[PDB]
Amino acid sequence: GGLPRVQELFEARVPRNKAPIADVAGRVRLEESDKFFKITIVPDDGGEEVVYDKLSKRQRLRVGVLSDGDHVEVGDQLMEGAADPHEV
């Protein structure tokens, strides 16, 4: 979170602590595993459910804060962190 972060962005590098971006739009089914997180996106498209299996409980969520049933637009960030520029 500083000059290294700025250098991280201009250099097009994968962030230290990553974070998923929604691959499709729709409501989310959120589950807490043992010392883990699982976020499943039920798309408005009515198609294949997109699942993000394991996310460390330390990264928290994007604020407000995500809860079960919240609608998610495509490019929205899920859990707090730095999203992969190559991913968006």
Curated annotation (Swiss-Prot):
It comes from the Bacteria. The RNAP catalytic core consists of 2 alpha, 1 beta, 1 beta' and 1 omega subunit. When a sigma factor is associated with the core the holoenzyme is formed, which can initiate transcription. Belongs to the RNA polymerase beta' chain family. DNA-dependent RNA polymerase catalyzes the transcription of DNA into RNA using the four ribonucleoside triphosphates as substrates. This is DNA-directed RNA polymerase subunit beta'. It comes from Mycolicibacterium smegmatis (strain ATCC 700084 / mc(2)155) (Mycobacterium smegmatis). The lineage of its organism: Bacteria, Bacillati, Actinomycetota, Actinomycetes, Mycobacteriales. The gene is rpoC. The chain holds residues 1027 to 1122 of 1317 of the full protein.
